[PDB]
Write an enzyme that holds these catalytic residues in place. Structure first.
Site, short mmCIF file in Angstrom:
data_model
loop_
_atom_site.label_atom_id
_atom_site.label_comp_id
_atom_site.label_asym_id
_atom_site.label_seq_id
_atom_site.Cartn_x
_atom_site.Cartn_y
_atom_site.Cartn_z
N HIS C 87 7.94 6.26 -0.91
CA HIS C 87 7.98 4.81 -1.11
C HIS C 87 9.28 4.38 -1.77
O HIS C 87 9.95 5.17 -2.47
CB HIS C 87 6.75 4.27 -1.89
CG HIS C 87 6.84 4.37 -3.39
ND1 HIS C 87 7.55 3.48 -4.17
CD2 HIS C 87 6.25 5.24 -4.25
CE1 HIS C 87 7.42 3.82 -5.44
NE2 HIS C 87 6.63 4.88 -5.52
N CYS C 88 9.63 3.13 -1.54
CA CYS C 88 10.71 2.48 -2.29
C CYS C 88 10.14 1.16 -2.81
O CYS C 88 8.99 1.14 -3.25
CB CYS C 88 11.95 2.35 -1.40
SG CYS C 88 11.69 1.73 0.26
N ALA C 89 10.90 0.07 -2.77
CA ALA C 89 10.42 -1.25 -3.20
C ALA C 89 9.88 -2.00 -1.98
O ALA C 89 8.70 -2.28 -1.89
CB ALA C 89 11.55 -2.06 -3.88
#
EC number: 3.1.3.16
Lengths: 168, 168, 168, 168, 167, 167, 167, 167
Positions: C87-89
């Site tokens: 995941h990232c943002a």
């Protein structure tokens, strides 16, 4: 109060957080809010006039294009017997820069004095280095000479005041 | 309402905050939402079609790559008798840029007129300088000439309209 | 579910918002969370192993330094019969880039195919242009040739796939 | 606790989130808070002394201008039998950089050792590459030689420690 | 050598040939375009000289002379004279102006105009900045481009240079 | 001096030696690679000339000639001739092409190829951009690099230049 | 040619004329300002030499010599002598110093000073960095500018170069 | 002129004097440091030559030669010989190496070393990149700097150039 400082009888500088506190601003006789951010929306209380200056806190943001217009507005409001809050997000860079420009134009003080003036009231101020380049140019336009210079340090090019501060 | 402005019968520009207000958008007959941000997730109401344009508000973001595709979508929706909201975060730069490109392509108006059109409705608009470079190129592609030029000021290179505004 | 997409039997890509939904991740058999952000803290549920990759979504962030280590971790977890969420943002750039690198290294697919693979499942992906430069180098290291090239457009230098997409 | 790590008897490093937890900081005998961010306002509990270092986590932020002043403050507090928390937002870059500088100046450890020291306690640390350039200069000022070099990789110029880590 | 004919009224050359009046008179040259800052016009009476005082550097704004030089070559042609466009090496500055001329007055796209001049003078090699400027000028004239700038491991170059490296 | 032998069929030199036909004929040279924009080929009939019109600048895309020039030197060698690769100073442009040739056709890594040419012609000093391009070419040929670019107080340079500064 | 008179006590030229003592003595020249790094002063006894050792490059800080050179030309004029300001090409370095002189001592704005020198020596073409420096110097002297830097498809240039490209 | 004595065993010069063996022998010169890429060593038997193949450009990593050249001048001095450090113009490349030598072997700070060389050869003007490198070398040797880079309207320069512009 945290996040707001008085600079002159008719000029306050702040963080965006104080800008929506209607009671706090009324207590200071604030009639005009200059929102020097792109990213914070005007709360729009009926009690205040709002001016949006939609800049990012970045060295290449052309904040200087607002020096005369914001300084003139602060002056106009003051002469109409009101008061202005110039706010950004952190109360550190964008708003301080515009207040410094106003002090030079309407209080006949050089850039070093204008910095020291605002810094005495809000010690956390720290205009970014691009804003400094722009203030120095504006000072030269107003007075034909400069009282702060950009200098190269091991940590980057900065106004001389920052280098001086680093040595206590 | 704060954070939304009508540009044409079938095109609105806004802040991301209005984009999740189902009732507000239905009241305007909005059927399609163009989310011109990387950082705001689509709310995904069933009532709207969603188009994500995942750009940052930065001068090197290649927003121009979406000029034709977003402008064509706005046109497609309009011809299908719907309406589009193009939103970003602040309603200042990304969305305004895409609306200006649409006005040039489908309303036969030069870049200066297209800017003035959007600025009349949402005075806070301020596309970043890279977006301006890209709009100027697109204008030249459409009309074979330009009505805004990038000019060097003491505060940076900006479209001439920003320099003109700085002098009131 | 919004904000998460399956790429392989043991690899999911997402927004940071889904990363704290214990039930959603358990439902997918996720055992390992790769947090490819500096700015989002690990929620730290006991149920998951956490790996922090503290990068910003910026073209000069050296994301390539994590290509082998993250790809190896995804592979290790899969061979231990678990599954990884990267995941990232926004679920657009940082996480997608790492998933594309993994697909090339462990699924023997060229960069164009690896992009199309992830894009088929999560159409909003859009690695930044620096990440593209880094992926292209990594592809060349793996296969001795490249299937995506950086090309100059009126709107900036971009991978050819972005230029192709702009023309529908 | 998540988001805080002890570096020495009188020095802690953290995320901004822990900085407002009065009880957590009192439990550690923390008397002074160094807020190494522009964007997080000091909570201002009466129990702590606050020092604002208003920097962004950017490679051209001149963090080095605070190396001596923050390191001297940590030392002053320690000699007065208190303890300092140096916090930023993520606890990854700004605060770690200042702690590394302090360890070199007051614990007579080279830059590689100072990095390894902080990294042993908070493995997520990752000063940005500009901060690394500045630390390397400061190390050279202190010891007349350097123990970390900036090296060019396919993914950018980085301190050699990052390249070494990428190969496991 | 150091001189190549591009059209019936246009020659491209090195600085060395510019002062050789017999060589120039034998080709009916009446106009000399000196596309250099560093070589002085010899100023023989029999030729008209136009100086284009640019360096061979990617940011030299040679495109500001595309129309003026193209128009002069055309004017000279219509008056039944001929023009020599020279630089120092006959590789970059003069080649670029000739290419621009061919697009404006011979109605050929950039790829064709480059191929034409290259066929006549195989050493030609406009610098990468001049290529950017030629590409923009092509887009102005035709509304589309036939050469793109592309990133290679060795730098951003016109795609024709990338193609040449593999053949 | 101004000429150094690199292999049995490859010489490296300054521009000064390029026109000296006796000097070149005494070494069995049949091919001249002129790796300069600024020096014109002399064009003696007895040699074939290849012009590589590049400046000695870090962003000149000399790597686009690595394969073509290496292949020509090889072709000439196989035909029992010999090639001179010259620039102006015999320091950077020609040295870089020779290094690339050694990697492709003599199966030596970049460090070895640099050391080889440097041993033959001690003044050689490819510019830092040419080094970046050589490093990428090495990685293409071998899948690993034996020279890294490193930051010194005086600029980013190949590690071999940093090492030389301390000895 | 290679020499142009700018005022009664100021001449602008190419390097070629600088050593010609008869030519200089015929114009009453007593002072030679050599605005080049690369041309050595000839040092005839009869002239005083001032060297301004700058390259013709946009980041060469030629503005640091605006006052010193302007003041020297003025001093020499007041002593009933005359100055030659020369560079290599008589295009950029020397032209820029002459323009600065005219603003300081002839009370003309930048546009007028450029037009004046250009009228006297039509080949003049200060580089774009020198223009930035001239613009700042104009603002210092007068508190306003009469030339602006503008972006064209071919680069950022003084507006006078953009205007010239369309005429 | 073109030659200046800096110490009893060190001379600074232009390229022109480098080949004049009588001139060099009259000063007891035994070692020639050629700090240029573009001028070939003449190679008279009676002198030892060291080539430092750098351009006069701000990013040329001349600081990589500070210790090696300083050490050679010192070694030659101790052997009762003398060294000539020359470049092309005797302005920048050679001046910079001489300044570095004075700091290392004559225990003077950067300001003093610059003033010393400038007194001996008034035309000297190291480029701004060379100044950055000298400043870092000074900090390495002494732990403090005596010249700072400062922004002027005309560019970032060593403060000594700013001071000179106002006097």
């Amino acid at each position: 109060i945290g996040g707001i400082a008085q600079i002159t009888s008719s000029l306050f500088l702040g963080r965006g957080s104080v800008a929506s506190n209607r009671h706090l601003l009324q207590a200071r006789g604030i009639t005009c809010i200059v929102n020097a951010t792109i990213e914070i929306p005007n709360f729009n209380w009926p009690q205040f006039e709002y001016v949006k200056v939609p800049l990012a806190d970045m060295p290449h943001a052309p904040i200087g294009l607002y020096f005369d217009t914001v300084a003139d507005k602060i002056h106009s409001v003051s002469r109409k017997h009101g008061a202005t809050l110039v706010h950004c997000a952190a109360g550190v860079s964008r708003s301080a820069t515009l207040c410094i420009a106003y002090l030079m134009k309407f209080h006949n003080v050089c850039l070093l004095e204008a910095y020291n003036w605002v810094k005495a009231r809000r010690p956390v101020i720290r205009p970014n280095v691009g804003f400094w380049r722009q203030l120095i140019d504006y000072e030269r336009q107003l007075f034909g000479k400069s009282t702060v210079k950009m200098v190269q340090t091991p940590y980057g090019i900065v106004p001389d005041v920052y280098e001086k501060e680093s040595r206590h």
